[PDB]
Design a binder for this molecule. Structure first.
Ligand SMILES: NC(=O)c1ccc[n+]([C@@H]2O[C@H](COP(=O)([O-])OP(=O)(O)OC[C@H]3O[C@@H](n4cnc5c(N)ncnc54)[C@H](OP(=O)(O)O)[C@@H]3O)[C@@H](O)[C@H]2O)c1
Length: 286
């Protein structure tokens, strides 16, 4: 990309969102799933480049990092601890609820004792007393919902979790969770090409809940679409940057976490916060 947003990217240009009304982030965050090996498994191939991605965040204004016990597993949290501890000026969000038998292989396990073991492992790896934003990675359909929600309420009471998020949930599931704890954020798949969670987004906006879109660059597959390309060309931008600028303008509660393991791509992603789309642009994209 050649546009002026490339010159000094700054995630604070996306605005500040106060998670739960008290924990401030710049909305354009960083997804830390990709600083792992193929299959979200083990160390990344170029570990030193992954370390440089983390080191680059502060100067680009990125202060919101999303990871998970299951990213690696362990590897993503460990690299975050290596490079970002003691996290001055950072909010690290993490998750438990998925097990990892191998590359590309995921298993839901929401048993309360397993959720607690995952949370305790994250605390120890990240070297903190309390997780700022802890997310139920999935509601495990094999375990009664209320037992998982009750375990998480215990995490909050025990002071181990500050704010609670959900992931890939419906409005009905949010309202059920709300009987046990405030839902500070949800993290649902959402991007310009996949708006199945539109109703949940509107619910989050109506209730001041942060909406974290995962796969905000549709897993990097932003190519081949003439209208997106035309909006990008007009801004001296890439299609991926317009995809991010689109969701930033779509709703004031959206908190994109584009994932990358390369410094050049991190810079391009943060630079999307400096783009100003018109309402002509939004009309064309939708
Ligand atoms: N809660 C859930 O169920 C869930 C599920 C999936 C993801 N997530 C979280 O959401 C975050 C983002 O989602 P995602 O990583 O799966 O997909 P994504 O951010 O939409 O796209 C990531 C892909 O795009 C590439 N990429 C990123 N920036 C690029 C750029 N400027 N130019 C070219 N390629 C670029 C990346 O490869 P390179 O490394 O080569 O740049 C990567 O392969 C994840 O990291 C994770 O934190 C959550």
């Amino acid at each position: 990309p050649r546009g002026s947003h490339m010159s000094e990217p700054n995630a604070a240009l996306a605005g500040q969102f106060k998670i739960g009304g008290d924990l401030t982030i710049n909305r354009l965050g960083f997804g830390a799933m990709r600083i792992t090996g193929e299959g979200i498994w083990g160390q990344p191939k170029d570990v030193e480049e992954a370390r440089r991605v983390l080191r680059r965040l502060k100067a680009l204004g990125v202060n919101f990092v999303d990871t998970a016990e299951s990213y690696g597993p362990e590897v993503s949290e460990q690299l975050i601890a290596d490079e970002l501890y003691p996290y001055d000026g950072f909010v690290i969000a993490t998750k438990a609820g998925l097990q990892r038998p191998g590359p590309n292989h995921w298993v839901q396990d929401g048993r309360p004792e397993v959720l607690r073991r995952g949370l305790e492992a994250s605390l120890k790896r990240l070297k903190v007393e309390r997780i700022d934003l802890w997310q139920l990675h999935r509601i495990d359909s094999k375990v009664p919902r209320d037992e998982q929600f009750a375990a998480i309420a215990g995490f909050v009471k025990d002071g181990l979790v500050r704010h609670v998020g959900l992931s890939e949930v419906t409005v009905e599931e949010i309202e059920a969770a709300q009987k046990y704890f405030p839902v500070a954020t949800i993290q649902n798949r959402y991007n310009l090409f996949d708006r199945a969670s539109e109703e949940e987004l509107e619910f989050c906006e109506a209730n001041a809940i942060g909406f974290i879109p995962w796969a905000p660059l549709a897993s990097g597959r932003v190519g081949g679409r003439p209208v997106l390309e035309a909006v990008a060309q007009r801004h001296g931008a890439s299609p991926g940057q317009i995809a991010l600028a689109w969701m930033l303008k779509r709703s004031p509660v959206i908190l994109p976490i584009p994932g990358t393991g390369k410094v050049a791509h991190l810079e391009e992603n943060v630079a999307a916060a400096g783009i100003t789309l018109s309402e002509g642009d939004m009309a064309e994209l939708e």
